Design an enzyme around this catalytic site. Structure first.
Site, PDB file in Angstrom:
ATOM      1  N   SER A  44      50.413 -41.628 -58.095  1.00 25.32           N
ATOM      2  CA  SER A  44      49.021 -41.929 -57.420  1.00 25.32           C
ATOM      3  C   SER A  44      49.677 -41.801 -56.132  1.00 25.32           C
ATOM      4  N   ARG A  45      49.322 -40.591 -55.402  1.00 21.71           N
ATOM      5  CA  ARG A  45      49.865 -39.740 -54.437  1.00 21.71           C
ATOM      6  C   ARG A  45      50.222 -40.552 -53.175  1.00 21.71           C
ATOM      7  N   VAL A  46      49.336 -41.724 -52.755  1.00 18.96           N
ATOM      8  CA  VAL A  46      49.595 -42.622 -51.740  1.00 18.96           C
ATOM      9  C   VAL A  46      50.188 -44.029 -52.267  1.00 18.96           C
TER      10      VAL A  46
END
Lengths: 498, 187, 233
Positions: A363-365
């Site tokens: 979850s990139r952020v």
């Protein structure tokens, strides 16, 4: 004079502004001569009966992509411009409805109560009309919540090998959104919109039957464009789902949109582009497939409080053909999306079902929409697993192991067993936090690998019986107090192997 | 093949027409009839400019030809066969293009230079004449080639004057001198 | 009706006709070009303008003299179906090629048809079992289902299917269709023979089987509409 009169006699005698006459037509992609007035992307009514959007404008021949069969089209036919860029009915009536791409109910519940119409193309909210994402979404899958927490707004890409019940991973989210649905959460509830592209009517129908079995469709909207249904309508299908979603988002209502299979959208646009004679991008997907996908995905957002604070959440679903992610469409999407949720087929067979390839699952952020309690418990779940990966490599050399590595190995195996889940079973966070506490605090290390599954069920039953007060508190406060932690530690000890 | 090679694309029709009517030695006739049908094109502007557009059938295209040859019977005969060709090949956008190309090709066969003296101002007739005289005096005109010379006004030519004819130009401009100045006074 | 055309081009079996008359057959119409060797059924697939269609030719083009008269037989090719198609092996055209003579056609139906609607679906779940253990354990079938097999064909692939015919179709009471696109003629002859032998086809009396056979010899275009033909039956 008389010559001019005879010329006038054989002339078109139409200025072809606002109308124009077909001149050739083969392959379902018509090209018309005329249409001097014509907005781009407009819907044009062919005299056959067909309506067709217009994607190519050329000074010679304007290329109007038919939405229907060309079997009633013939050259020299007139097309009279609808004069309207494509539009969808949008509204609240869509809840509990299957609707096709053109926005006609194919559920056979007849005319929709979808108050309002909108346009397929809507330009995405800027930086200014948005607030930062901070609102949990819990899918009832422990791995998803813990490792890749989903926030309302965010785009999290479901990627992995085709027909591994890819759809089923998503359905699990819908099932846990039953908890909100039953709930009085409304402004905190996600209306789930499932978009089905390229799939047969029977598969989709089986899904709606499953959903009806699970008594969820009081908040489900099913937007469909079956494999039978036209490639233009398929191309148009994600963007018109997006518009339907934006009406919810606009109302301040939170929602979640599944775009399954977005990979099939790419095939559709490929077909269109090559028969609009547009230059082929690599892998024959045109070099602006990215533009289509990027604009689509950026229309899911978490608005500012001045903009309500509404939030459409997106889950695109991309099929990976041979698990190939270096492929142009997967590469493009990976960049666009704010999570990647790689699944692993081998691990599916290994019995993690769902099987999330947790190493490539991101979850990139990251986390900010993860339950506070769940943040505390799953803190070292990652570290253990990371160590487990290294340890596993040594373990598969199958030699005598370092004692430290065998602490990892023993714990690690149990963690894998925690990860294993069974399709169509959602789980309550109030009772998933305990299981992770038990595991991380190594109480599962003791009990044998086989009976971990038994322990989970039984432990939950024990907590349901005795520390049901504890569960209520975990539900109510969503973070673990010292008292709750102590209670929980004691409870685990009390039921350690019973 | 007949004098003056033109590598025109759809001007291959003009080239063909030229050599075909040159070999039938009915080129002056052709040119005149071509002028006449060209004139009747200009004098047919509604649906003879506004139906040079491709929408005509084979049958309807043929009937446009028939209406045109009703308007006049002054036709080379080879250009009536050419009219047939253009209808069948549905060449209609490069129809006046072919006319222009044959005209240039023809009047080149006759001999006639073209020329222009683009300037930043509309020069005198005395200037036109003096320059024309000068040009004829210069070995550029060797005879067998006549001249057209149109001074045109173009703001784009800044400085000097530019004489053009026979692909031979003398281009006086300020810009080149400015360029040299700029470059060296910045380096 | 007599709507003339000429064969402008024969670029493969994707003939282009120029319907001289501006009355132009519509797309998915069928055309008969008369030939000394039978006729050719062609199907309009594009209109390329100037009343020049480009037509798929469902028969193997050869001999064609450039500019051959056409007649429009109109619409999608209408096959002949019936209980008298049971037993028969039918050509793409629908011609009984097992020479059990002409089909007494009740209904002749268009090759092109549209799939039933989402609401018209009736979604089954009834288990169909074969008795093949690996199949039963790993991927049990369902009657009315869509079953799929992949890999190299006739690597015993054909045999595997034949085993399915042997098992499942000698346990299915309803009708059954075998349609073999690019079928190996000898295998087909064997199958037909076997079917006749096992009474599944019985020359006298009813056959609970009908057959469509498309050989891989037959030109690509014919093979393309073998599927649609079977699908109509």
């Amino acid at each position: 004079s008389i010559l001019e009169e005879r010329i006038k006699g054989v002339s078109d005698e139409a200025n072809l502004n606002e109308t124009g006459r077909v001149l050739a037509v083969g392959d379902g992609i018509a090209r018309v001569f005329g249409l001097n007035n014509i907005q781009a992307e407009e819907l044009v009514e062919f005299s056959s009966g067909v309506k067709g959007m217009a994607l190519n404008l050329e000074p010679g021949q304007v290329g109007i992509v038919l939405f229907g069969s060309d079997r009633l089209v013939k050259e020299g036919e007139l097309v009279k411009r609808t004069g309207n860029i494509v539009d969808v009915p949008v509204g609240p009536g869509l809840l509990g409805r299957v609707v096709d791409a053109l926005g006609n109910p194919i559920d056979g519940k007849g005319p929709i109560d979808a108050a309002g119409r909108s346009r397929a193309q809507v330009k995405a909210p800027g930086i200014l009309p948005r607030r930062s994402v901070h609102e949990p979404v819990q899918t009832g899958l422990k791995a998803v919540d813990a490792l890749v927490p989903i926030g309302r707004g965010q785009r999290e890409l479901i990627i992995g090998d085709r027909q591994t019940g890819k759809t089923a991973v998503a359905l699990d989210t819908i099932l846990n959104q039953k908890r909100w649905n039953n709930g009085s959460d409304e402004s905190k509830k996600l209306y789930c919109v499932y978009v089905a592209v390229g799939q047969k009517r029977s598969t989709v129908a089986q899904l709606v039957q499953t959903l009806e079995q699970h008594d969820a469709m009081k908040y489900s909207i099913i937007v469909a464009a079956t494999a039978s249904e036209a490639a233009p309508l398929q191309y148009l299908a994600p963007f018109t789902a997006a518009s339907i979603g934006e009406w919810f988002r606009d109302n301040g209502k939170h929602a979640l949109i599944v775009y399954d299979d977005l990979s099939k959208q790419a095939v559709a646009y490929r077909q269109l582009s090559l028969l609009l004679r547009r230059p082929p991008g690599r892998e024959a997907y045109p070099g602006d497939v990215f533009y289509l996908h990027s604009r689509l995905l950026e229309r899911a957002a978490k608005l500012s409080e001045k903009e309500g604070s509404g939030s459409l959440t997106a889950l695109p679903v991309i099929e990976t053909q041979g698990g190939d992610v270096s492929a142009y469409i997967p590469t493009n999407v990976i960049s666009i999306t704010d999570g990647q949720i790689f699944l692993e087929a081998e691990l599916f067979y290994k019995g993690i079902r769902p099987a999330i390839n947790v190493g490539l699952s991101v979850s990139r952020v990251g986390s900010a929409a993860q339950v506070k309690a769940l943040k505390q418990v799953a803190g070292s779940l990652k570290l253990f697993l990371a160590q487990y990966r290294e340890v596993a490599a040594f373990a598969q050399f199958g030699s005598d192991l370092d004692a430290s590595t065998k602490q990892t190995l023993v714990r690690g195996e149990r963690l894998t067993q925690l990860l294993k889940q069974n399709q169509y079973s959602p789980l309550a966070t109030e009772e998933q936090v305990p299981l992770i506490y038990a595991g991380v605090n190594g109480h599962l290390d003791g009990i044998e690998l086989s009976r971990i599954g038994e322990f989970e069920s039984s432990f939950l039953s024990y907590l349901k019986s005795n520390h049901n007060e504890l569960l209520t508190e975990i539900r109510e406060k969503g973070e673990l107090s010292k008292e709750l932690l102590a209670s929980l530690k004691s409870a685990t000890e009390s039921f350690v192997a019973t | 093949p007949p004098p003056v090679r033109l590598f025109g694309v759809e001007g291959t029709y003009a080239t063909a027409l030229y050599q075909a009517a040159a070999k039938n030695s009915s080129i002056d006739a052709a040119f005149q009839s071509l002028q006449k049908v060209e004139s009747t094109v200009k004098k047919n502007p509604k649906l003879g400019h506004l139906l040079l557009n491709p929408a005509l059938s084979l049958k309807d295209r043929n009937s446009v030809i028939d209406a045109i040859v009703e308007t006049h019977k002054n036709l080379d005969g080879y250009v009536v066969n050419l009219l047939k060709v253009l209808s069948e090949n549905n060449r209609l956008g490069c129809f006046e293009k072919i006319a222009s190309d044959f005209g240039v090709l023809n009047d080149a066969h006759n001999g006639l230079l073209k020329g222009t003296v683009t300037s930043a101002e509309p020069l005198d007739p005395k200037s036109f004449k003096r320059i024309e005289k000068a040009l004829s005096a210069s070995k550029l005109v060797g005879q067998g080639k006549s001249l057209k010379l149109e001074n045109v006004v173009k703001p784009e030519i800044k400085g000097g004057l530019i004489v053009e004819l026979g692909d031979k130009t003398v281009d006086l401009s300020i810009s080149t001198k400015i360029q040299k100045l700029n470059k060296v006074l910045e380096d | 009706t007599p709507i003339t055309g000429k064969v402008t081009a024969v670029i493969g079996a994707i003939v282009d006709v120029h319907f001289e008359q501006s009355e132009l057959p519509a797309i998915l119409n069928a055309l008969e070009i008369k030939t000394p060797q039978g006729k050719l059924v062609l199907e309009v697939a594009q209109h390329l303008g100037e009343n020049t269609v480009r037509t798929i030719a469902m028969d193997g083009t050869e001999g064609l003299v450039r500019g051959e008269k056409v007649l429009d037989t109109g619409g999608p090719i209408s096959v002949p179906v019936g209980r008298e198609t049971l037993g028969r092996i039918i050509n793409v055209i629908g011609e009984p090629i097992d020479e059990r003579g002409p089909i007494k056609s009740k209904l002749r139906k268009p090759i092109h048809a549209d799939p039933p609607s989402f609401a018209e679906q009736s979604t089954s779940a009834e288990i169909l079992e074969t008795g093949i253990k690996v199949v039963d354990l790993l991927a049990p079938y369902a009657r009315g289902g869509k079953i799929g097999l992949f890999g190299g064909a006739g690597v015993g692939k054909t045999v595997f299917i034949q085993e399915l015919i042997n098992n499942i179709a000698k346990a299915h009471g309803g009708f059954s269709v075998f349609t073999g696109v690019g079928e190996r003629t000898r295998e087909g002859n064997d199958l037909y023979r076997e079917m006749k032998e096992t009474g599944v086809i019985n020359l006298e009396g009813e056959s609970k089987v009908a057959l469509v056979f498309g050989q891989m010899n037959e030109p690509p275009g014919a093979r393309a509409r073998v599927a649609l033909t079977g699908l109509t039956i």
